[PDB]
């Protein structure tokens, strides 16, 4: 079975798409968000290492800790506040930068599904699962802020309502 | 988790469509951009259909792709060679959509083996990979850049 | 003619997604700075197409006229060495990204690893040309090496784990 290897592979894949997304973001307009995304990459590197550990050991604790989840939650609340109230369902995209963040959103969910599957097979750091779960919410929230700061509409499913 | 994987992968495709749209000049590609926005609504509908244990995705959305595929095959150079993905950045982004549609399709096939699906969703994903291939070639054509040939 | 889930059909499409991400990566690279790497990436696309054909032969009971041959693996190894030599000494772990071009090649790296995992799972269904697995294995190393050279030539730092 290869669920563990696929899980840390998929967190690595996510990390690579985060790298691409950063490059879409102007340094001045998104200095906050760019800093967060670099932080997230560091954290995804730690999550991958944690996933690769078959059993956590005395001399080798998990690196991914609760604080990283708490931070995402703080930023999500901030970005929901910043963006216009959501009136309709959102289709991914708008600005190239927002689009790249929606890709990160969906790939986070893919990584999550694999960690859920791993958890069913054996021991994981539960922080990694919680982190990936919140990341999709984070990427959704910042994508909307990115469109907002760039003065472009989110793409909406027409005539829908939340 | 096949069902959840299938609708997550339709959502992933939808996100890649969102990125491809941003590669396309609004004037040069008004037709194809409008179609891609339409497809994103349809993929959202397909995801909802997949998550159901009436279906929203209907035959007409497949017939639309088929009509456009024909229109674009007519516009594009006569293909008699294997084509590798890429050329313009915009065409490349649409070839990515093609391959990710095929990934979504594989999961929906697997889901169909396990339980009832809306057959329209499978057929639509299948046709989408042909659509993305044909539009990618039109995009390179309109930009006056070559497709990438295998030989 | 064949079932929708015929293993040979699935096997045939294994490397297509990676091929498309290579396509995107090429478009990020200026011919005047990257003629070498661009030429090799087109070569790799032709090779990935050949790998698909070979994978589709996994149930063939006769001798297989494989198209993927040792030489292409040797080629990647030599170019990797060249690019390691060019790039600055690697002393920290690298986070994927930096330039948009390098970021797109890090995406190829992770997608190649995904394709490699797919190919290992196909070994349960038939006999896989060993060159294809070796090739995909080395490709992730090739993409890592070129991503670093791409940042170097663009005079931008790699993104480091710190």
What is residue B24's DSSP assignment? S
C97 vs A42: CB contact, 8 Å cut-off? no
Residues of chain A contacting C121 with CB distance shorter than 8 Å = 2
* Structure obtained using: X-ray
Q: CATH assignment of A1-162? A: 1.20.1200.10
Identify each DSSP E strand in chain B by its residue range.
83-84, 148-149
Count of pairs with CB atoms under 8 A, one residue in B, one in C:
62
Per-residue b/e over B40-70, b at no fewer than 16 CB within 10 Å? bbbbbbbbbbbeeeeebbeeebbebbeebbe
Sign of the alpha-carbon torsion through B126, B128, B134, B136 = negative
CB C102 within 8 A of CB C157: no
First-to-last C-alpha distance (Å) of chain B: 41
From CA C119, how far away is CA A44, in angstroms rounded?
A: 25
Is C94 in a helix, a strand, or coil? strand
Architecture of domain B1-151: Up-down Bundle (1.20)
From CA B104, how far away is CA B101, in angstroms rounded?
A: 5
Mutation site, C17, C97, C102, C156, interface A, largest A CB count within 10 A? C97
Other C-beta atoms closer than 10 Å to the C-beta of A117 total: 15
Distance, in angstroms, between C31 CA and closest chain A CA?
A: 21
From CA C96, how far away is CA C107, in angstroms rounded?
A: 8
Distance, in angstroms, between A148 CA and closest chain C CA?
A: 23
Q: Which residues of C lie inside 8 Å of A (Cβ-Cβ)?
A: 93, 95-100, 103-104, 106-107, 109-111, 113-114, 117, 120-121, 159, 161-162
The bridge status of strand B148-149 relative to strand B83-84 is antiparallel
Q: Where are the domains of chain A?
A: 1-162
The Cβ-side half-sphere exposure at B126, using a 13 Å CA radius, reads 12
Distance, in angstroms, between A47 CA and closest chain B CA?
A: 22
Resolution for this PDB entry, in angstroms: 1.6
C111 vs A13: CB contact, 8 Å cut-off? yes
First-to-last C-alpha distance (Å) of chain C: 54
């Amino acid at each position: 079975d290869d669920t563990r290897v696929v899980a840390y592979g998929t967190t690595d894949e996510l990390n690579s798409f985060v790298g691409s997304a950063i490059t879409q973001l102007d340094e001045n307009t998104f200095a906050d968000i760019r800093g967060e995304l670099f932080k997230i990459q560091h954290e995804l590197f730690d999550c991958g290492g944690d996933l690769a550990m078959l059993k956590v050991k005395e001399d080798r604790p998990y690196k991914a800790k609760q604080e990283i989840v708490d931070f995402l939650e703080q930023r999500i609340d901030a970005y929901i506040k910043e963006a216009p109230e959501l009136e309709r369902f959102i289709l991914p995209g708008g600005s190239e930068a927002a689009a790249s963040l929606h890709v990160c959103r969906t790939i986070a969910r893919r990584a999550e599904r694999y960690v859920v599957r791993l958890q069913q097979e054996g021991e994981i750091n539960p922080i990694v699962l919680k982190y990936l779960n919140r990341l999709s919410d984070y990427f959704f929230a910042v994508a909307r802020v990115v469109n907002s700061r760039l003065q472009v509409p989110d793409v909406e499913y027409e005539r829908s309502a939340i």
